[PDB]
Amino acid sequence: NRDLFAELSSALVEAKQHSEGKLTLKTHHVNDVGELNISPDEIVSIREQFNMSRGVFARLLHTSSRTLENWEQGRSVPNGQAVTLLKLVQRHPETLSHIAEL
Amino acid sequence: RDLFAELSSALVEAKQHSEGKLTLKTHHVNDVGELNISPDEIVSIREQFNMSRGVFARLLHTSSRTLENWEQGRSVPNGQAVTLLKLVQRHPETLSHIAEL
Amino acid sequence: KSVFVESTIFEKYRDEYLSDEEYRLFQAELMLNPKLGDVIQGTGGLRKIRVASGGSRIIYYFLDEKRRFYLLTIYGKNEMSDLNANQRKQLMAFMEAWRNEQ
Amino acid sequence: HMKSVFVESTIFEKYRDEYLSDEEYRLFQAELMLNPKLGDVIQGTGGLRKIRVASRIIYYFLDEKRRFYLLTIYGKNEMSDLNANQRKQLMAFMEAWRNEQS
């Protein structure tokens, strides 16, 4: 009831026509994040919206207060997973509780 | 409502509680401590989402080779790495949140 | 950035093989490695990739210039007819006739 | 794991709900846990500490073995500050603790 060659043929003439701009096909545009970036100001604001000191918040991120402060003043750049967690708790505040009870 | 009366009362209560002659309402609280994860738990996390080292490492914002070094036991991930991994483990939906970030 | 274009055939049969989650995942995988499916010899650039989970699934696609994936058809690991040599020849004929015009 | 224990006086016990919510209070326990010396000593009370957390001000005392006695809690301006007589009394009382812990 279903034949391969016919399908590939139909799909390839379809594809040809879409490349010519003579046809419209359902299309998914996808771009991947190359890298995430976060400013010191953003880190401060994130920490502040939870009403937390550098120490507590840094404990939650399993890093030293000194390190967090270094991110916040720009003397250091947090690593990839760090930025990921920070962005994560920025968008989804629920996750900081998850981290806490982990 | 006077302050000194309350301070005095609270302090003699405290003295007696230290002595053990009195019961007060008390909360035992402990820290988050440290986290650790085995390489096999890592590969199991990746295998449960049925994804390649490449994609997984992309979501974890790291190179495939680094992830391999973790999984093969050749390396230990940093703090935020282990945190993130544990997070994805206990709460799988997180992995989607990270995707749409 | 990359693009996924679906043929009407693929669009029709996609839901019955790939769920939206494993489909999104499939796109991610394919985005990291566009050549992941190996070329079928004599088809003039047609690629075939197997996807696992139960039974596996087979996706036929064609990788175009400017990083756009033409997704032709999709069906089960219980495989349809492996194409007759004549059919492969006709396919490569269409592919070359497409390529020469550029 | 560094464990800390918070002993509520009956005053603090009955008046806690009216001021601080469970969440704010949990946060308070964390903050005070990471920095035991967070509250600044009241002059002349010999080790009595006081902290302002925004539901504003809290009097507490720090014991050995990470034990915190929460004495009382109230708003910014509520009751009058302790005069030097009261301070002398409080310190004199505290010297029993300093002597017992020695």
Q: How far apart are CA B44 and CA D57, in angstroms?
A: 49
Number of other CB atoms surrounding residue C63 within 10 Å: 18
Question: Which residue do the tokens 């069906």 mark?
Answer: C75
User: Would you call B101 helix, strand, or coil by DSSP?
Assistant: coil
C-alpha–C-alpha distance, residues D20 and D53, integer Å:
9
CA A77 – CA A83 distance, rounded (Å):
9
The encoded tokens of residue B101 equal 């970030």
Question: Please, how many CA atoms are within 13 Å of residue B93, restricted to the half-sphere of its CB?
Answer: 4
Helices (H), A1-102: 4-19, 40-49, 54-60, 65-73, 80-91, 94-100
The closest alpha carbon to C61, from C27, C16, C96, C102, belongs to C27
Element (H, E) at D5: strand D4-8
CA distances from B68 to A97, B46, B72, B82 (A): 30, 11, 6, 15
Distance CA(A57)–CA(D30), nearest Å, equals 10
Give the torsion through C-alpha atoms of C69, C74, C77, C79, to 10 deg.
Answer: -110
Neighbours of D100 (CB within 10 A): 11
Half-sphere exposure of A42 (CA within 13 A, CB side): 15
B contact chains, 3+ CB pairs < 8 A: A, C, D
Task: Look at chain A and count its residues.
Answer: 102
Q: How far apart are CA D9 and CA B7, in angstroms?
A: 10
As a whole number of angstroms, the distance between CA D61 and CA D48 comes to 5
Structural domain containing residue D2? 1-102
**A63 to B79: CB separation less than 8 angstroms, yes or no:** yes
β-sheet with D48-52: strand ranges across: B25-29, D4-8, D67-74, D57-62, D48-52, D40-41
Technique of determination: X-ray
With 0-12 / 13-18 / 19 or more C-beta atoms within 10 angstroms meaning exposed / middle / buried, residue A58 is buried
How far apart CA D35 and CA D13 sit, in angstroms, is 22
Q: Are B68 and B57 in contact (CB under 8 A)?
A: no
Domain range enclosing B69: 1-101
| C44-51, Cβ contacts within 8 angstroms, sequence gap of 24 or more | C44/C91, C44/C92, C44/C93, C44/C94, C44/C95, C44/C96, C44/C99, C45/C95, C46/A8, C46/C72, C46/C91, C46/C95, C50/C77, C51/C18, C51/C22, C51/C26
Residues 6+ apart with CB under 8 A from D1: B30, B31, B33
Are the Cβ atoms of D1 and B1 closer than 8 angstroms? no
Q: Left if phi > 0, otherwise alpha if psi is -120 to 50, otherwise beta: which for A79?
A: beta
- Give me the resolution in angstroms, 1 decimal: 3.0
CA distance B41 to chain A (A): 15
Report the amino acid identity of residue C77: K
**How many domains is chain C partitioned into structurally?**
1
Distances from the Cα of A88 to the Cα of B2, C79, D17, D21, angstroms: 47, 42, 32, 26
Q: Rounded to whole angstroms, how far apart are CA atoms C18 and A28? A: 15
Q: Which tokens belong to D75?
A: 């708003």
Place of tokens 């197997």: C50
Residues D30, D26: Cα–Cα separation, whole Å:
6
DSSP letters along C4-60, please? EEE-HHHHHHSTTT--HHHHHHHHHHHHH-TT-SEEPTTSSSEEEEEE-----EEEE
* Sign of the CA dihedral running D19, D71, B25, A58: positive
Contact B78/A at CB under 8 A: yes
**Angle at C56 (CA atoms; ends C23, C53), nearest 5 degrees:** 60
> Which residues of chain A have a Cβ shorter than 8 Å from any chain D Cβ?
51-53, 55-56, 59
For residue C56 the two structure tokens come to: 């596996």
CA D83/CA D86 separation, integer angstroms? 5
Interface size, chain A vs chain B, as Cβ–Cβ contacts under 8 Å = 73
Hey, is D61 helix, strand or coil?
A: strand
Cα distances (angstroms) measured from residue A26 to each of C8, C16, C41: 8, 17, 28
Count of structural domains, chain A = 1
Residues D75 and D63: their CA atoms lie apart, in Å, by 25
